[PDB]
Every structure is written in C-alpha cells, then in structure tokens.
Design a protein around this ligand. Structure first.
Ligand SMILES: Cc1cc2ccnc(N[C@@H]3CCNC[C@H]3OCC3CCCCC3)c2[nH]c1=O
Length: 130
C-alpha cells in the first residue's frame, strides 16, 4: 500500500542520513569507497563480500534494505572484513581495526539514539508479510 511505501521511504531517508554522517567523518575515509585492486591485489581473493559506504548508499537507493537490521548487517560486514584482512600487530593494521570498530560503534550509537523502536518494529512486520 501507499502507507507501506511511505514507511520504506522514511527508512531510506533515515539510512542515507546515518550513512552520510559516517562518510564525512575523517576516521572512516578508508571505508568510503571500494578497495582499488591495483593497490591491494589479494583483497578480492581474501574478502569474499567486499562492502563500503558508497555501496551501502547504492543499496539504499536500490531498495535493498527493508529494515534497520538489514542495514546494520552491512555495517557489521564493513567492520568484520577489516578485522579479517588486517589481523596483524603492525600499527597500520591496528589503526584500521580501531577505525572499523569505531565505525560500527558509531552507527549503532546513532541508531540507538535516533531510531524509534516502534518504527523499526513496523518495518520488520511489513517485511515478514512480504
Ligand atoms: C579497506 C582496506 C583498505 C586498505 C588499503 C591499504 N592497505 C590495507 N591493508 C594493509 C595490509 C598490510 N598492513 C597494512 C594495511 O594498511 C593499513 C592502512 C590502511 C589505510 C588506512 C591506514 C592504515 C587496506 N585494508 C583494508 O581493509
């Protein structure tokens, strides 16, 4: 119905706003775009489902997220990919792991403060009837 389409449009507006606020944070610049295969050749072989904030924005616009839970699975993916690909004790690896965890904690914190729980429940109940 039109009311269900209104609900998903509001969701999309909310998710774009959250993603924009992550994307403009200097700490998270490394997660804003896909990894360049020329700079990092083995990334594509090691990381089976790459994810980045530009991809997330594309998925919002393609209507791929019908709940905030689905959205947070891709934010979690951005984080777990970074922890998987950069596991070493070296400062570079430790810096990106720290930023990846900050990205994840920041996304969850914005959602905790600004997502109405009854709005998320509505989205879930529409998706389960789809
Ligand atoms: C998403 C992503 C990008 C990336 C770019 C370059 N290098 C990476 N990994 C390196 C592996 C070897 N140890 C050093 C690592 O680079 C740490 C840098 C990454 C850019 C931000 C400052 C620290 C990359 N790994 C990735 O997961």
């Amino acid at each position: 119905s039109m009311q269900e389409e209104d609900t998903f449009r509001e969701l999309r507006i909310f998710l774009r706003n959250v993603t924009h606020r992550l994307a403009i944070d200097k700490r998270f610049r490394v997660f804003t775009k896909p990894v360049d295969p020329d700079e990092v050749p083995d990334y594509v072989t090691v990381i089976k489902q790459p994810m980045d904030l530009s991809s997330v924005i594309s998925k919002i616009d393609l209507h791929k997220y019908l709940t905030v839970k689905d959205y947070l699975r891709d934010i979690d993916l951005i984080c777990s990919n970074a922890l998987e690909y950069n596991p070493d004790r070296d400062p570079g690896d430790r810096l990106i792991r720290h930023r990846a965890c900050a990205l994840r904690d920041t996304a969850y914190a914005i959602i905790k403060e600004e997502l109405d729980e009854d709005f998320e429940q509505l989205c879930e109940e529409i998706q389960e009837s789809r």
